[PDB]
Structure 1
Amino acid sequence: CTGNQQSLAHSRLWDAVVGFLHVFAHMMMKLAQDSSQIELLKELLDLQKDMVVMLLSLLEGNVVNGMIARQMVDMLVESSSNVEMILKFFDMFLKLKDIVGSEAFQDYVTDPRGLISKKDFQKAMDSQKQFTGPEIQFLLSCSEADENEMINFEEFANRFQEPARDIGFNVAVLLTNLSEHVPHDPRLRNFLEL
């Protein structure tokens, strides 16, 4: 409804989403550091799915290097920090799904029950490259405990998967698409790399 599309573009809308991106990052980060409030996190992700999808609607039917798509990448430049945070939240919990399961890791876990200990976990993710120190401190937080050595490695890995089976998908579509209608554009490139 192109006549309607320009109305939202010339509207006090971008300053609303950039604020949303900011608040989405911290609670998504704060909520993960607990096991009882995990239930609220699920419907918080559902809000992310219903927020990014409307950005697709603005972008549908757009011309290459158009004016609507210019503000899409422009709004991210200011709302960057928030975005990046989200993308990270995904990687982190998608690289763990692999680590746990890698021969190496299964060599640190030494116990019948099927649980690793905090110390070990640290050593593992640290012995392996990546996973900068402070991130390791965070991961030994969103984890559970039980004698500080019952971090049942399994669950953790396959916990925040399904809930975000999407979100991560619908940001992949977002970065790719703009990355086709607004071709030559450095700003965006950076995002796609992360």
Structure 2
Amino acid sequence: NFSKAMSVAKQVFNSLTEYIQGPCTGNQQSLAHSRLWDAVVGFLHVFAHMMMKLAQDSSQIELLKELLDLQKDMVVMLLSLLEGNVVNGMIARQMVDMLVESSSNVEMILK
């Protein structure tokens, strides 16, 4: 059930990248003024805690692989929102606040 839920989440993140990749400024601006950040904050929290819990066990290696590739597709989506950004841009400043809110969960990932 965890595997299939992540499988769907991979496709939905990959679709969102397609809409913005090749700077589509309007599509990038739309995803800014939306609830995408809330889904981004929530996914980081689940990612961080599931990483450490599943790293421990030797029977969760396969599930940890699914969580690993899913998080890679998510950050690729965040990078796509930054294509063509200017300094002090709307999309970049709103992206900082998301990282500020999820600072604790980012720290657990980086270690």
Report the TM-score, using the length of structure 2 for normalisation: 0.76
CA RMSD of aligned residues (A): 0.9
* Higher relative contact order (CA closer than 8 Å, sequence separation 6+): 2
Mark the runs of 5 or more structure 2 residues left unpaired by the alignment: 1-23
Of 62, 69, 80, which residue of structure 2 is paired with 1:39? Answer: 62
What displacement does 1:12 show? 1.0
Hey, which bits of structure 1, 4+ residues long, moved more than 4 A?
Answer: none
Once residues 39 and 49 of structure 2 are traced to their aligned partners in structure 1, the CA distance between those partners, rounded to angstroms, is: 17
State how 1:122-161 maps to structure 2 within 5 Å.
none
Whole-angstrom CA distance in 2 between matches of 1:36 and 1:74: 36
Is residue 2:106 matched to residue 1:83? yes
- Look at both structures and tell me which one has the larger radius of gyration over its CA atoms: 1
Higher percent of residues as helix = 2
CA distance in 1, matches of 2:49, 2:27: 33
The one-character-per-residue Cα deviations of 1:49-83 (angstroms, maximum 9, x if unpaired) are 10000001100011112111101111111111111
Matched residue count: 88
Secondary structure of 1:32's counterpart equals: helix
**Whole-angstrom CA distance in 1 between matches of 2:94 and 2:45:** 18
Percent identity over the alignment is 100
Q: Which runs of 5+ in 1 are unaligned?
A: 89-194
TM-score norm. by structure 1 comes to 0.44
